[model samples]
Target chain A: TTFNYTNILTQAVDELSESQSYKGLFHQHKDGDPLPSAKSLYKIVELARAIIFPGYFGNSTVNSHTINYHIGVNVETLFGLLTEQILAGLCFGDNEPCRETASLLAARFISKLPELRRILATDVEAAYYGDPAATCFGEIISCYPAIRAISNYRIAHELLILGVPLIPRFITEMAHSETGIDIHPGAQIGHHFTIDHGTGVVIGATSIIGNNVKLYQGVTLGAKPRHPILEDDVIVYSNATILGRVTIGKGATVGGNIWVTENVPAGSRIVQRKNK
Target chain B: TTFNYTNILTQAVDELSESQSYKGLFHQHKDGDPLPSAKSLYKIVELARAIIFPGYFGNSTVNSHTINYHIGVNVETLFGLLTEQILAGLCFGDNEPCRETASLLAARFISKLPELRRILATDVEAAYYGDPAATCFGEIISCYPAIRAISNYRIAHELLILGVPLIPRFITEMAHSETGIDIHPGAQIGHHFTIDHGTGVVIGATSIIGNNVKLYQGVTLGAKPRHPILEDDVIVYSNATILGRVTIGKGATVGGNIWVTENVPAGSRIVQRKNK
Candidate 1:
């Protein structure tokens, strides 16, 4: 068929090249694969989820019988993707050919899958019990955005700890963009943690949150010279902005829509003026 | 290779058989197929975007010359997927063996593609004009989560209107899970509709919004027991909870972090106390 925009589109290509509106958008030539792909990383995270969770929302049964088979099938695919992505990361970061290092890192991350499974179980438990809206653990696993974001964080966090760089940030950013839950890979969060109504919750880099801590929606934890520490049994309520080096003590309940910057005593209830 | 969990896992399968932790998780056995799949729905939506918004964050060039070939290839794949999904929805909803009906529905949806393109053009226009941050239509369509969420909503809303069953909800829920902007398929939104900052914006079922209506983040339209009409040129700003059946007047602005119940006069402004 004769196209109307043909000559114009073809003519536009030269101007695009000369003008280069695509400056910084274009990737430089590389010896290996040009760049690590987000879609590749998407599939990588997806396969990882299947291997770890092993059923509902994936391509297999959740039965203990076929769990091994299912996990085994996905693991092989994941290892290849992980290795290539790690290699791409190093290349993108201007490192050595580093194929061997990438392979080794891939193997290490695989070995950490069981650990991921174990920790994610606690997250699931925390999610199931923390929210009254949930009827089952299955619902939380499938329906809740927190589980998706946190699981991604846990996955990326492990990769970050394993010394692979940009990929970890990519994994977490994918979650952040999707869930509106911004969690830095460098943040140290403890077990049995659940974020209620997860949208707009931010946990900054180098921040430390101890076990059994719950962050309700719209909570912002900003970066300080020394990261803020939220000790165990802390529940920072909705829309609470805990800024700069505030050590929320163990067993503290910080209430909704308040801005706090000082260290709060243990068992203190922090709320906005009036109401409750 | 022998897995220690093999026997343990296999033995537990019988227990699972007796228990079925996979209760509602398991899809019912059907003649043609089991249930409408989310992943399949994901691909369907992805393919639709590529077709309408062609050469997006998709697998094609944005250039006009190759647009037809890309659209042609994806259209063929999309037709098959759309037909299959529509069929599965019918089966899942306990309808007749409506394979022919599905083919008809899929074809009709495709015929509606040009209309989708025209309307989505207005949406992209609205998004670009409404947001100062956007550099161009390209940036808005490709980068903005509102574009992603709204496009999916519009697509799903069309399918819902076309009499597709579970598939429409599947498409919207997929967008909701990813974008945190939950627009019900039943929401009667007008052309040039846009939501700024998008997250936590819920447009409930039977909700009506006229042309040029812009909603800032966290604006919730609760289902009153008219279903809350937001007339033309209305701007509901951030975190405004407009609850119950309220007719927000034409050309009015509802301010941030406020609660509203009554109807507002046309072209009026509503703001939170002490927020100026």
Candidate 2:
């Protein structure tokens, strides 16, 4: 008696496809309606990066003279890609937000392009100045993971802010899977913010960071309804876990491998007691 | 008042399109000329990892008998990609090194394939033995960002050694941006090297690392005119900064969060002083 492989395969497929049990996992698409592509979203991210950091990415010849052409083309391309993704995101859920809303959101996002570049410039500065080993601005843009991760975060945060859903989380998670830096789209980060060796750095949804903040690797600003708030000029070093709405005050320095549950006063230095 | 939309757009375009100001900023190329692609390079890196460490990445159908077949196909794919990218790198600069040079360099890089696998096997063993969290070789290969980054570094390092330019740097930076572990192509590292939770780990251009060396997260082995050197059996714990042409002598252990400028003698233990 030979084992019936086809019968089991049929039974398995039938059971798995039963909508009553597998309700939310399946997505049905209608003809002409846009469904988001991870591939295209990747391209969208790339185009945004290329526009934001000219001469670093994409195939365009990006000198100051050609910057406009490059940016013009990229912005146009981004608008189309983003509009489609936004529309798809709207359609993904039960409530249909409609194509007009998607178009408006994408246009608003494009309008914020200059602002995105302006903020990311601060990020580039943060990464370069924070690392003594960083050679130049070009090197920082070309090589730094912090820049890459943060760029994704900034892009995602802006999209989330513009009322685009699903896509923003998708974008940040792409960076997360690739870079090991998990920054929730709702995290509000201030100017000149950077994380060094940014792997295992997790910023929660409600976490807020002030200007000129620097985080080293493995720093988790986590556990919310009460999210962590880091005020201006804060430096939280590696492996420091600041949990549950704690504020590390302005100009404060939290040292490596420490756990802080309380508010650290401004200008204070917190370090773990050494193990002898 | 009506918004002067055309006027605003035209002014922005005019300001950005003045070619003379962007001469050094632009990279012009012909349509047919190969441009080293980050996307393709990423695939090459993935293929190399799949070959070097079996049962992880790319296709999941790997076993003892099929290992050779899997490696053979991947190596063949890698050869084709390396050749194109090597040619692209050669052509990227003002002085084109020619296709013949690119082909030769690619072939030489491929010839070292066995050694790459050998060294990577040691790395797998090292990672498995060094960390309690690593359940198996497959787990290390599948989930470890250190493996991903290091494999890319090793591949780029080999290409750089074979006189491929621009592309090697691009490859390592791709890994750097993705993994937050920045390893320069110029650094010479020995076998059995592994880093745990490797985010923010930096190994500099001229730094040298010996066999059986393990580094944890946020560790920086940096600088040159004097790059730091780690001899055999050196274990550097998390967030330790070893700077400038210093030698961490054989059989030495440097504890977490300490800063070391000077050389350590063989068989010594270094740790941060306990807080009073």
Candidate 3:
């Protein structure tokens, strides 16, 4: 009998998913505590994304008028969901009873939603303005990789600031999974960001970008990493290296593959010239 | 004398490093807990690479006969250095005194080096066997972005497991900054890895891959993000979308731009036939 190859593999994935280690991968484990359930944490991150980016995520429907209302509903739901997930993240990373700390974290995140909205708005505006190919803000929100990646990061970073532990990382990972770009939730980014080609770009935790910054594929905004993890913003071009703790001034451009570990002046252009 | 340049506003980067914000960005925040210094950490990561692959990373002066000696020296040094950096990474993310916990983490990580070494050895073998174009283990260790990124993730993830806090993320970010690939330190990867034109590639925190795996540019081993984050060995050709905790079975190849949220069986080849 002729076998269906697709069906065979699907079954295999199912079997693999049932394996103990695969299940354990989802369940965050601590030395004493049982691993956190996978499905529960997943819901929290999903709700947070949907709330943060109104039309683009959540596996749901959104029209212009419904946008605010949907976002309102989602945001309210997200805070509750995110609080639990944040606690889970915290506990997943640290198994002690950090419930009181988690509660405080939840409250802080709820309070910061307004600022989060403003920042996300700038991201949407940037995504819309940066792409000549984009038809509208809605289209960019729904389809573009940059917007998707940025939205998830913005939301996750906010949670991180509010002291809501592990959710920030999970949220950013969600974006990386979707977009092929990894942005740490702890990174400090400026407004009006645009990414061209939008793949394989990484922004470090200590990076500080200026407003209206544009980066191409493989661009890295990194720190000149010294001990004590001293990090500062140093804009990097495709495949460029900015290791350790160093600052890159506003509006400076760094060329590809140059290893930089020093502060840069604002509005300066840096390029790596090949030796003649 | 008149200058013939079209862009009159550009300056050299070194001249502009004096900006207030730029200065502020790199300076140690007065309020935050001081970070453990970083040069040693970079050296440790570098040495770890050499240990894992033997003579591929760091300075030249290496060969097969000296592998054990080299690895032993490096691993001891790496253990000591990583303890400091992992503590630094954890403390970098937040302002707190988790020093007691951090030290405990250091102890655990120092103990786990053997396990970490074993996994890394498998990765080295995978890299060596997977790439036909590779001349030697040294090439894979020194030149391949995959190895660099994967090695960083392996070390960082171990720190993460030890709950050393913010440091694992920082190490992983360092890998991302240089490699244009972001891998969460927490993710699990199988052996015999290969990538063709690996630029802009991303592997999510929850992703898993089987043996003899290969990917091209812009390939993402990610899930169609729903509420639950789960996925399995799903080969993605350039620019493919696998979203939302979906399963991709062994040997299945997913062509670019197809958003997959369901399971694809083993030995199946999938491509996006329709725009949607």
Candidate 4:
């Protein structure tokens, strides 16, 4: 034969086995170890969404009477999925936490579900009221990409707060890949926060977003490691780049295509200088 | 001693059992009815992307010799999927069209595959040349969200042109959710069109775009039901909203963060009034 498949396979395997090439890049996975599955986490997100928005997502037959039962079942399933993923995360690290730690964290997250639902309701309301194109609550729930991305962010943010390492980032990045809206899991976002046409909206790790804040498409709220605090009721229009550790005061407006590096006083409007 | 599950279930059953609440909201599904699965459409999009870009997605083993085989297999699968989904759309509506109509539409979509590949090649060329951030064609094909969204739009636009019903909208909405780029399937776009950072770019149903037209993030081509025509070589910067049935002259430039509702002269520049 001109080319031997056995030799090619043997040579490639030998090269790959060299430790120097994959020292830091490779994840050493033990057999039977629970590696965080993107598919499982996807179902976890779906379950949470179904529980939060009754009758909109999975199993549209949910009526008010059946809502509690569905919520209870979903909450139970979410707990199981989160525990496994958390354990996988712990095993991936140097520290070996007991299974109890994962169970506890999962329980803690389950307890926070009602609060998550409360905030997400505000988000849905904000999205509906903000966009004239939004027909109804059902339409927003059914069609809006912002809602899906934001829901992922909210769920992942909670997990980050509860110290589930790697998994939270994985969750948010999943949303980022799907929706082009990258919200760091460590960001502290308040209630009624909504992103309109949300693709490419990057909110950094240390960013603190206040209540009633609305961001449009391609808005970067602190792209760097530093934090940018947005006070309550701030509206940032599309493609506005807000950098550094600046504070946008309450009720301030940032116009599209503007770059902000400094703090703005309350109710102030910041826009790009006109180029005629 | 215990919170009774039976009592909670009893109360919920009464509230949810009210069929009147969910009368119009529920989508009654019959077994074997093709409801245009989002999950399947997602794969359809991926298959098309992989076919178009070859080595950028799915399999990395594609070479000159194997390209034809890969394309052939993908085309066959894509044809099957499109037929089923188109059939589902037909069944979903009140009209009970025969399976032959669906088959015909599916075949028609497949027939345009070569032309789709042709236009997409121009898009790739334009995107690579337009964005300084793009390292190579491979990087653009693999990582650019615009290509993903546009590919879906092009595929769906063809189906819409072929008179396929709700499936076309479902196809585009899948891209919308994934990329935040909402392009109506009815729009007519020319070759070498590239969108930068593409989030929040909405091209309306009736909009007609000429060749070599570039649009930045948050660019809305049309705000109303009417079509907005852009001549060849027009560039619209970030967040520039062009409303109504207006025409932007050939080789003209629209600056950032401004709203234009009127027609601009050929080779002219439109910008906002200077800030004090």
Best-fitting candidate, measured by DockQ? 2
lDDT against the true structure, per candidate, is 0.77, 0.79, 0.59, 0.78
lDDT of 1 by residue, B1-276 (tens): 644323433343233223244333434434335356677788998889888887774454457678778889999999999998888766654557567999999999999989998999999999998778877998888778888888898888889899887677667768877778877778888989898987877676778999999998877775323468999999998866565679999999887765566787799987755522
Worst 10 contiguous positions by lDDT, candidate 1 chain B: B10-19
Candidate 4 deviant stretches above 4 angstroms: A1-11, A20-33, A60-73, A223-225, B1-36, B43-148, B154-169, B177-181, B184-212, B216-229, B237-247, B253-264, B269-276
Worst-scoring 10-residue span by lDDT in model 3 chain B: B5-14
Best by TM-score: 2
Ranking by TM-score: 2, 4, 1, 3
RMSD of each: 8.4, 5.9, 26.2, 6.6
Docking class of 1: incorrect
lDDT of 4 by residue, B10-31 (tens): 3433443333433333344444
Give the alpha carbon lDDT tens digit for every residue of B136-214 in model 2: 9888888788988888899899988877767777888788777778888888999999988877787878899999999
A1-276, model 3: which lDDT tens digit per residue? 547798898889888777666565565466664334446556665555555443445323223445455555565465555556666677665447555566556555655555555676676676666554333554344345677678778777878776666667777777676566778898777777766445667778766666777665555555543311212233344444566666667667665535567766766867653221
Residue A100 CA displacement from its true place in model 1, Å: 7.9
What class would a CAPRI assessor give candidate 3's docking?
incorrect
Estimate, for each residue in B98-155, the C-alpha lDDT of model 3 and write its tens digit: 5566666666875776677677667667667756787787666667788777778878
Off by over 4 Å in 3: A1-276, B1-32, B36-40, B63-73, B93-101, B210-212, B222-234, B274-276
- For model 3 the local lDDT of residue B76 reads 74
lDDT of 1 at B104: 91
